[PDB]
Amino acid sequence: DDELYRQSLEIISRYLREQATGAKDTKPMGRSGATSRKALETLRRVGDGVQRNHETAFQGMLRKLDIKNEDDVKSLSRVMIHVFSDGVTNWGRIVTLISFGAFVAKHLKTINQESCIEPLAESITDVLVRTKRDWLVKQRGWDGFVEFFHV
Numbered sequence: 001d002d003e004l005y006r007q008s009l010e011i012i013s014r015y016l017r018e019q020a021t022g023a024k025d026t027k028p029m030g031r032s033g034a035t036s037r038k039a040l041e042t043l044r045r046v047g048d049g050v051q052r053n054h055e056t057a058f059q060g061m062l063r064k065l066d067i068k069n070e071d072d073v074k075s076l077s078r079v080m081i082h083v084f085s086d087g088v089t090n091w092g093r094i095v096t097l098i099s100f101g102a103f104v105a106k107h108l109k110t111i112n113q114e115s116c117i118e119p120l121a122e123s124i125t126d127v128l129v130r131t132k133r134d135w136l137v138k139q140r141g142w143d144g145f146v147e148f149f150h151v
């Protein structure tokens, strides 16, 4: 019933799963998929920049998260909510959110827990769309996201 969440999960889920592994999801994309393909391209060009530019902090935070299993995923949500929700809302901070999601997803594919990439995505999507919905609606959602990072 919730269209922006579902779009957002399709974008975020694919960015993370494709980052943790080698290849893209070749499923055809749901409603608003030309924007989702574009937003996904944007997350690849800017997400990788953000990940290489913050590696040491990402390595620190990923290492003190000590993620074993899928039940660890949703105590993780507490530290990410704590770090993401209370300050300034803008597109850079949301892209940093999704890029650390890709970082942790890669780690989880290393420790043979790729089955936890999707719950992670869901949690990230749910945290972004819940606490930021009004902002996302007034900034036009993913079309605004693509236009903001356009080159």
Ligand SMILES: Cc1cc(OCCCc2c(C(=O)Nc3cccc(C(=O)O)c3)[nH]c3c(-c4c(C)nn(C)c4C)c(Cl)ccc23)cc(C)c1Cl
Binding pocket: 054, 057, 058, 059, 061, 062, 076, 079, 080, 081, 083, 084, 086, 087, 088, 093, 096, 097, 098, 100, 101, 104, 124
């Ligand atoms: C998937 C997931 C996503 C999570 O959050 C994403 C949120 C974004 C974020 C920020 C951030 O928000 N910066 C920022 C920019 C402008 C203003 C304010 C403000 O305070 O108002 C903040 N910092 C992060 C950092 C970071 C950096 C970089 N430096 N330091 C000290 C830290 C803690 C690390 Cl290691 C990972 C993510 C982030 C968190 C987790 C745990 C997961 Cl699993």
